[PDB]
């Protein structure tokens, strides 16, 4: 599995160094350093999102360009860390205006349709297109929860939360008060949340068939980048989420599917 190989510490460090070298040393057709200008424009307008084109990444690193579409989570995390390091080197004071630099992947060679997604595409970086039909408001979501212990008043460390399950607390050093654990509102870190709904294009839908739809999740800078009735090109991680209600309804164990959005382009 590519996930196991990229999970290796030495492989992780090698990928980190390769991405740092790619960011620092990538000349253009005229020799200009593209990422210097990109980071300058990003920090000049107080953004926290850095776009990366897949074509030049493949041109300068084919191994990583092959690893990415198969393990899009850890690879993107390493890319984010390397980008943050490079930005901090270039702009030492940017730790005030931002706390995490995100990497957005553009021009992914593979393009699919909402009607041809099967279990083969699970946990893979896919690229689809469609028309937005629904857009909920921006709600806050728990990013890193800081559980406390009533037995000792000491507060446990951060616990990352995913969009697929409910995070549970760990173990206190010596007084094992697993039960009496709560959440404080002044140290927990939150993040923006928005769940859009995309459907097939009016022109591209088969006459005999009916339009299909899939749910997408937008977080952090991605929120409020779409409005209902807009044609978009969505790149994200196809993700599988259990839904017992559908199981009971259909009478057969079935799971819901959602897309964790990573890059959105409006055409």
Q: Work out whether strand 102-106 and strand 49-53 pair parallel, antiparallel, or are unpaired.
A: parallel
| Neighbouring residues of 232: CB distance < 8 A, sequence distance ≥ 6 | 129, 130, 131, 132, 198, 226, 264, 265, 266, 267
Q: Should residue 141 be labelled a site residue for another protein when binding is judged by CB under 8 A?
A: yes
| Neighbouring residues of 65: CB distance < 8 A, sequence distance ≥ 6 | 54, 57, 58
Q: Which range, of 31-39, 64-72, 86-94, 243-251, touches another protein by CB under 8 A?
A: 243-251
The CB-of-178 to a copy of itself minimum distance in angstroms stands at 6
Restricted to residues 66-105, the positions that interact with another protein (CB under 8 A) are none
CA nearest neighbour of 264 among 202, 214, 196: 196
Q: Which range, of 53-61, 81-89, 118-126, 197-205, touches another protein by CB under 8 A?
A: 118-126
Give backbone dihedrals phi and psi of 124, rounded to 5 degrees, phi first.
Answer: -135, 150
Q: Which among a copy of itself, another protein, Zn ion, none contacts residue 172 (Cβ within 5 to 8 A by kind)?
A: Zn ion
d(CA 152, CA 172) in angstroms, rounded, equals 9
Q: Which among a copy of itself, another protein, Zn ion, none contacts residue 7 (Cβ within 5 to 8 A by kind)?
A: another protein
Per-residue mark of binding to another protein, 161-180 (x: CB under 8 A) = x-xxxx---xx-x-------
Tokens 């921006």 label which residue? 138
d(CA 223, CA 22) in angstroms, rounded, equals 29
The CB-of-252 to another protein minimum distance in angstroms stands at 5
Q: Which among a copy of itself, Zn ion, another protein, none contacts residue 11 (Cβ within 5 to 8 A by kind)?
A: none
Q: Is 75 exposed, middle or buried (0-12, 13-18, 19+ CB in 10 A)?
A: buried
Q: Should residue 149 be labelled a site residue for Zn ion when binding is judged by CB under 5 A?
A: yes
Tokens 């984010």 label which residue? 80
Applying CB under 5 A, the site for Zn ion has a residue count of 5
CA nearest neighbour of 48 among 71, 80, 25: 80
Per-residue mark of binding to Zn ion, 175-204 (x: CB under 5 A) = x-----------------------------
Please give the structure tokens belonging to residue 128. 């689809």
d(CA 259, CA 82) in angstroms, rounded, equals 25
> Which of 142, 144, 155, 156 is the binder for another protein (CB under 8 A)?
142
Per-residue mark of binding to another protein, 22-41 (x: CB under 8 A) = --------------------
- Binding interface with another protein (CB under 8 A): 7, 9, 115, 117-120, 122, 137, 139-142, 161, 163-166, 170-171, 173, 185-186, 190-193, 195, 208-210, 212-213, 224, 227, 240, 242, 244, 246-247, 250-257
Q: Which residues lie near Zn ion (CB under 5 A)? A: 149, 151-152, 172, 175
């Amino acid at each position: 599995t590519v996930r196991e190989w990229v999970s290796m510490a030495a492989t992780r460090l090698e990928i980190y160094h390769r991405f740092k070298n790619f960011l620092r040393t990538h000349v253009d057709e005229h020799g200009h350093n593209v990422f210097k200008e990109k980071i300058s424009d990003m920090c000049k307008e107080n953004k926290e999102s850095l776009p990366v084109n897949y074509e030049d990444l493949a041109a300068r690193e084919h191994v990583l360009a092959y690893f990415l579409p198969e393990a899009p989570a850890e690879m993107l995390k390493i890319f984010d860390e390397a980008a943050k390091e490079v930005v901090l080197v270039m702009y030492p004071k940017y730790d005030r205006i931002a706390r995490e630099i995100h990497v957005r992947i553009s021009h992914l060679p593979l393009v699919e349709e909402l009607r041809s997604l099967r279990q083969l595409h699970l946990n893979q970086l896919i690229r689809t297109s469609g028309v937005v039909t629904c857009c909920t408001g921006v709600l806050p979501q728990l990013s890193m929860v800081k559980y406390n212990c009533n037995k000792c008043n000491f507060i446990l460390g951060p616990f990352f939360q995913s969009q697929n399950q409910e995070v549970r607390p760990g173990s206190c050093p010596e007084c094992q008060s697993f039960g009496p654990f709560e959440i404080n509102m002044e140290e927990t870190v939150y993040q923006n949340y928005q769940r859009i709904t995309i459907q097939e294009s009016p022109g591209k839908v088969a006459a005999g068939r009916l339009p299909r739809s899939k749910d997408a999740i937008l977080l952090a800078d991605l929120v409020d980048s779409c409005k209902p009735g807009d044609e978009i090109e969505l790149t994200g991680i196809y993700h599988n989420n259990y839904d017992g209600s559908l199981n009971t309804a259909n009478g057969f164990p079935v799971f819901a599917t959602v897309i964790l959005a990573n890059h959105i382009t409006k055409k």
